[PDB]
């Protein structure tokens, strides 16, 4: 159990179900003796774009600009934009991280996809040496909590919207696990434009119950980077003895590591593997 | 063949490979007698956030705000924000649509993920009746062209980054096909931070070759919405006779329609199915 957390609301409104879920998250963690940092994004009319004005001091190369390179430099010295630096020390503090938001266009709203870019800078958040489960934030846990337009049958394995494990891999593995996070199961509060008034409290209640023993959960299964060739000459492929083990096995490992086989369904939604 | 197009650069720089790819796209289409609209996003320091100030006139409900509902209303009358309306008539004009950008955090940069939200409004872009291949933009074609941090072996089926078909479903199906677009194959220009100076011309050349007979291509396979239960009582599931046809078949249909089976690999990258 850890003494700290971070919540990130990503909806304009303070009337929304997302706000209520955040205030429900707040009151829940506050009730267990956790510190609850809040990066209410829309409230702090946050910057979502990457111009060259993230870096404070002189540009090392102001002719052609690799933002990748010029950002990494700016961190280690200590002259980035301090609205990035402010948000960074919350993460160094916070053991848990909760992202509350709506699914609009099969992904996270624009204002969080700018948060991810500007804050998660190389060395700080990710390295191309310290990757995935070896990554900086490996001693942390992270959770998603989404508010969907369609129903839960639409995003089934055979709904028109297709699988939901598929829409969570880009995020839960590609961002959170890539930095280090032991990604816990997400909270899929579907079709909220239909739900009754009382069932928009049952959801808010089941959330608070869940948040009690949240650190003591077991996270989702991602093929650990102990199973891979971490050098860029072989091609960063999966280790060659482990390839033969899975050719007698029926499923994949993750969604992205389907291996052209069965997807162990609810890989990104349930944890028991 | 159509007499129009639209390109959307989503990188700050005009030195970038993305800019060169856009200028290469521009000169290519201009050479074939196509009109080339350009929404150079960073140049038009574009708005990526959704506040309530997209709608011009009075808010129908300024107590609790569904942006979904208040946006749809605002379109059909004709008093949205005109920087949205300006971008919209380009789409009504443009037959083809090219998205040039970098893959940062397993997806599209923040400034395009705001473009998608504010411009693709209900009735205009998508409907919950006219869905997918029946959708508004069904008489149009759309393409992606990406610039990646890692190499092409990393995003193989057994690389640490996992599949690339998996990272393209959220976008190519969940955005473009959902509106209508017959999504043509994407342009995966990998690891550009390593590439030699001359091979950063071979790529720019092969692009221009490809753009000549681009409309005469055959698009990617997405399970058409003729195969689905388009009413929200059964649950928007796949039609019940078609379910039995695929239980004797070995592969899935799409990535999201894996059906817990093999993924017909390069579903989102090659077209022959
Ligand atoms: C916060 C952050 C997170 C990231 N996360 C990931 C991740 O999770 N996974 C991942 O794989 N990558 C990641 N990346 C890396 C990202 O993919 C790279 O930024 C991008 O792929 C590299 O292209 P670029 O547009 O940034 O570079 P460019 O600015 O396009 O550099 C390309 C070079 O080609 C030159 N060039 C070639 N031809 C021409 C021409 N005709 N005219 C002019 N110049 C030319 C340019 O001058 C330049 O030097 C991340 C980057 C950042 C900043
Ligand atoms: C009752 C109430 C009040 C205020 C606020 C709220 C709320 O959070 N609404 C809400 C409900 C749903 C979404 N997501 C979508 O609408 C949506 C758009 C496009 C897609 N898509 O194509 O997958 O899904 C966003 C906000 C609900």
UniProtKB/Swiss-Prot annotation, chains A, B:
FAD binds at residues 11, 17-18, 66, 103-106, 147-150, 155, 200. Homodimer. Interacts with PDLIM4 isoform 2; this interaction stabilizes PDLIM4 isoform 2 in response to oxidative stress and protects it from ubiquitin-independent degradation by the core 20S proteasome. Interacts with TP73 (via SAM domain); this interaction is NADH-dependent, stabilizes TP73 in response to oxidative stress and protects it from ubiquitin-independent degradation by the 20S proteasome. Interacts with TP53; this interaction is NADH-dependent, stabilizes TP53 in response to oxidative stress and protects it from ubiquitin-independent degradation by the 20S proteasome. One of its GO terms (biological process) is vitamin E metabolic process. This is NAD(P)H dehydrogenase [quinone] 1. Residues 224-273 are annotated as: Important for apoenzyme conformational stability. GO terms for molecular function: cytochrome-b5 reductase activity, acting on NAD(P)H; identical protein binding; NAD(P)H dehydrogenase (quinone) activity; NADH:ubiquinone reductase (non-electrogenic) activity; NADPH dehydrogenase (quinone) activity; RNA binding. There is a cross-link at residues 249-250 (Glycyl lysine isopeptide (Lys-Gly) (interchain with G-Cter in SUMO2)). Its EC number is 1.6.5.2. The gene is NQO1. The modification Phosphoserine is found at residue 81. Substrate binds at residues 125-127. Keywords: Cytoplasm, FAD, Flavoprotein, Isopeptide bond, NAD, NADP, Oxidoreductase, Phosphoprotein, Ubl conjugation. It catalyses: a quinone + NADH + H(+) = a quinol + NAD(+); a quinone + NADPH + H(+) = a quinol + NADP(+); ubiquinone-10 + NADH + H(+) = ubiquinol-10 + NAD(+); menadione + NADH + H(+) = menadiol + NAD(+). InterPro entries: Flavodoxin_fold (IPR003680), Flavoprotein-like_sf (IPR029039), NAD(P)H_dehydrogenase_qn (IPR051545). Belongs to the NAD(P)H dehydrogenase (quinone) family. Its cofactor is FAD. It comes from the Eukaryota. Inhibited by dicoumarol. One of its GO terms (cellular component) is cytosol. The lineage of its organism: Eukaryota, Metazoa, Chordata, Craniata, Vertebrata. Quinone reductase accepts electrons from both NADH and NADPH with equal efficiency. It is found in: Cytoplasm, Cytosol. Gene3D superfamilies: 3.40.50.360. Pfam families: Flavodoxin_2. Induction: By dioxin. By oxidative stress.
């Amino acid at each position: 159990v850890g003494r700290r957390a971070l919540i990130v609301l990503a909806h304009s409104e303070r009337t929304s179900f997302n706000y209520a879920m955040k205030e429900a998250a707040a009151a829940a963690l506050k009730k267990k003796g956790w510190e609850v940092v809040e990066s209410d994004l829309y409230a702090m009319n946050f910057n979502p774009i990457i111009s060259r004005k993230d870096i404070t001091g002189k540009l090392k190369d102001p002719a052609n600009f690799q933002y990748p390179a010029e950002s990494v430099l700016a961190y280690k010295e200590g002259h980035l934009s301090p609205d990035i630096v402010a948000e960074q020390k919350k993460l160094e503090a916070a053991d848990l991280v909760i992202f509350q938001f709506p699914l609009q266009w099969f992904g996270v709203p624009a204002i969080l996809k700018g948060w991810f870019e500007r804050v998660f800078i190389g060395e700080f958040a990710y390295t191309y040496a310290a990757m995935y489960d070896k990554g900086p934030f490996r001693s942390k846990k992270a959770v998603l909590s989404i508010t969907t337009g369609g129903s839960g049958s639409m995003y089934s394995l055979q709904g028109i919207h297709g699988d939901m494990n598929v829409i969570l891999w880009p995020i839960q593995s590609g961002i959170l696990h890539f930095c280090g996070f032991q990604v816990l199961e997400p909270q899929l509060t579907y079709s909220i434009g239909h739900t009754p008034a009382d069932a928009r409290i049952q959801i808010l209640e089941g959330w608070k119950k869940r948040l009690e023993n949240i650190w003591d959960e077991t996270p989702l299964y991602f093929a650990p980077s102990s199973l891979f060739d971490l050098n860029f000459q072989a091609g960063f492929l999966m280790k060659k003895e482990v390839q033969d083990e899975e050719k007698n096995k029926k499923f994949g490992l993750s969604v992205g590591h389907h291996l052209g086989k069965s997807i162990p369904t609810d890989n990104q939604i349930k944890a028991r593997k």
